[PDB]
Ligand binder design. Structure first.
Ligand SMILES: [Cl-]
Ligand SMILES: [Cl-]
Ligand SMILES: [Cl-]
Ligand code: NA
Ligand code: NA
Ligand code: NA
Ligand code: NA
Ligand code: NA
Lengths: 166, 167
């Protein structure tokens, strides 16, 4: 993805769902995304035991002292499996600040240790100030379909990777 | 857990559920269990993301060439979160034979990568060829309640442990 482009091309990417429910109060726009794993841009399926990167590109229309990107994964039938954001997932505790006109890319990296099936991915962006509050600016809910093909043998929705000893 | 004791004391342990559904063909009995995490025996809850040991003790009434212990973890509303057995968890490494009268302990160790809340654990013992022909011997289904604690919950039920960076 290019930081010098601000066109909303999100809808053009592999896995995009026209069934997305987009909402938000405005002031920033999630204008693109990228998914990659094991050297492949937009792999047709994801799998466990390797990293996948989930990238979102945002253009900000105002200065904000604090911006918080987030991700959500649901089952195809709508069960919330896993959601996180920069406040929960970052090692550091510093606010991400932006200036009017800034274009930023946010990257969530995780091993997709889910059982085989289809899952729904969402990206969101919130912003605000410590002395006021945080507000959802753009939320692209259930906007990307993920096909998972497991690479380990396990049962249930998540591979907890147990060891075994006798 | 003592290998020289064969009394079925499973029902006396912390977290045991009288609501268990125990089933099986017989030939072995899961007679005890133990849970430990960070060196603490039977902690009142499991910390999210922390390695926890789940141990089961079995007495075998017959010789078996290939015994296969297993576990299941589910939510209260029946969502199947994770299951495995000795064969799957070890990627085919483990093959366990026993003689009549033997008492064995089996341990599954895993990071409890779950959100705060209550979960249902099962311990089972089966025998045979795991892929194609396995006889369930004693299956203690939804027999233990687990409590998971965290400081800050994420959204949902399973922790995929994402990292984060910005550009
Ligand atoms: Cl192992
Ligand atoms: Cl191994
Ligand atoms: Cl069972
Ligand atoms: Na709306
Ligand atoms: Na979603
Ligand atoms: Na596993
Ligand atoms: Na029965
Ligand atoms: Na997490």
């Amino acid at each position: 993805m290019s930081l010098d482009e601000i066109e909303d091309v999100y809808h053009t990417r592999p896995g995009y769902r026209p069934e997305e429910y987009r909402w938000g109060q405005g002031g920033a726009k999630i204008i693109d995304y990228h998914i990659q794993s094991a050297g492949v841009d937009f792999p047709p399926s994801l799998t466990g035991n390797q990293q996948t990167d989930f990238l979102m590109k945002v253009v900000f229309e105002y200065d904000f002292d604090c911006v918080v990107p987030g991700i959500l994964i649901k089952t195809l039938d709508g069960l919330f499996l896993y959601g996180t954001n920069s406040f929960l997932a970052s090692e550091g505790r510093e606010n991400i600040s932006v200036s009017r006109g800034d274009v930023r890319v946010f990257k969530f990296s995780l091993p997709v240790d889910l059982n085989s099936g289809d899952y729904l991915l969402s990206f969101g962006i919130s912003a605000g100030n410590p002395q006021t509050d945080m507000t959802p600016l753009d939320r692209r809910y259930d906007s990307i379909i993920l096909h998972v093909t497991k690479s380990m043998d396990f049962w249930g929705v998540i591979d907890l990777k147990s060891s075994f000893t006798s």
